[PDB]
Amino acid sequence: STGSATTTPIDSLDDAYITPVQIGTPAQTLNLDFDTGSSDLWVFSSETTASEVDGQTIYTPSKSTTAKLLSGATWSISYGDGSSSSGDVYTDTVSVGGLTVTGQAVESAKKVSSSFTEDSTIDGLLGLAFSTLNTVSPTQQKTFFDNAKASLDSPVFTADLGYHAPGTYNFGFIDTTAYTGSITYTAVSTKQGFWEWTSTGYAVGSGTFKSTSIDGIADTGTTLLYLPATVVSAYWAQVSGAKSSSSVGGYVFPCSATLPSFTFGVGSARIVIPGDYIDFGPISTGSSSCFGGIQSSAGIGINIFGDVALKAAFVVFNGATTPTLGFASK
Numbered sequence: 001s002t003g004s005a006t007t008t009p010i011d012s013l014d015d016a017y018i019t020p021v022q023i024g025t026p027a028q029t030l031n032l033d034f035d036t037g038s039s040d041l042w043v044f045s046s047e048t049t050a051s052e053v054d055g056q057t058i059y060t061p062s063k064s065t066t067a068k069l070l071s072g073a074t075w076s077i078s079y080g081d082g083s084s085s086s087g088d089v090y091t092d093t094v095s096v097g098g099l100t101v102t103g104q105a106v107e108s109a110k111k112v113s114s115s116f117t118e119d120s121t122i123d124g125l126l127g128l129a130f131s132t133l134n135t136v137s138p139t140q141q142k143t144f145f146d147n148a149k150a151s152l153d154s155p156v157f158t159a160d161l162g163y164h165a166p167g168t169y170n171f172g173f174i175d176t177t178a179y180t181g182s183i184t185y186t187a188v189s190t191k192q193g194f195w196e197w198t199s200t201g202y203a204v205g206s207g208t209f210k211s212t213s214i215d216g217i218a219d220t221g222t223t224l225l226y227l228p229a230t231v232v233s234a235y236w237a238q239v240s241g242a243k244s245s246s247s248v249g250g251y252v253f254p255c256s257a258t259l260p261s262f263t264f265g266v267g268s269a270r271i272v273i274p275g276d277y278i279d280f281g282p283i284s285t286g287s288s289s290c291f292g293g294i295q296s297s298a299g300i301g302i303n304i305f306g307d308v309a310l311k312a313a314f315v316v317f318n319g320a321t322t323p324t325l326g327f328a329s330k
Helices: 114-118 144-151 229-236
Strands: 003-009 017-023 028-035 041-043 068-078 084-096 099-112 124-127 156-160 167-171 184-187 196-204 210-218 225-227 243-245 250-254 262-266 269-273 279-282 289-292 294-296 303-305 314-318 324-328
Touching: 003 084, 028 041, 041 084, 068 099, 099 144, 184 196, 196 229, 210 225, 229 250, 229 294, 250 294
Parallel strands: 028 124, 041 099, 210 303, 225 294
Antiparallel strands: 003 017, 003 167, 017 028, 017 084, 041 124, 068 084, 084 099, 156 167, 156 314, 184 324, 196 210, 196 262, 225 303, 243 250, 250 289, 262 269, 279 289, 314 324
């Protein structure tokens, strides 16, 4: 089997992407944030504290003839941005782009933190990291991908995120019309539960490539590109007036600037992030100070190849017995 679903930016800045997901019988369609940096599929629901719901579409398990309470199971997750959610668990039928999994753990939120409430466009998350990170207790549950894997034509999914435009998540096949050139594959460590790999270096604008190993994660659920302070300083040094602001919480730059591109290495191959992808707009409405899309990972503890990087590529998440990651230009 295969599946194919369109993923759409939630706003004009590509702060996140939502993908429609069918849950239950009859189908209840929710728009979920596909997140290769976590491993829980959770949704706003009829159980969510009412004051914490503001515009989201909810899953109502009592209206699904295939929903079954997973007795005794609870979940609780906290993300790198300090947000969180928790609740109980149902199993139900879940379909993405025509690909159907029966008995999928659907984690129903009883509580969500303010940033989730405040984002009316995101009805929940669909985790696509390794199932070892799944938070369900006392019996850990599998991700949608893990459940679908054996049924797929090939044990892969691909992320093709758009810049200020829709893109595609495919399951079980590689669309050879969706990228240019070849796909370069690189090794993955699953030791931390992430799609963790090592970039071979970087360049700033038309500058020379610096060969240096950068260990990090491919994370569709993180907006920006977080890299070591040395790398990030080298980038912003090429933008007149750019500076790191502790009050704003990162590098900012004059909105009048033209940003240079940023290249990252995948083996001997190179992925080029156009300068415009690194502009996240005014820090506040009407400001002429703009927020940078490349930020320091110092004190996160991990480098993160988030959407800024991934949207510049066609990305293969290869879930074979020995997982690997593939990147192509597009």
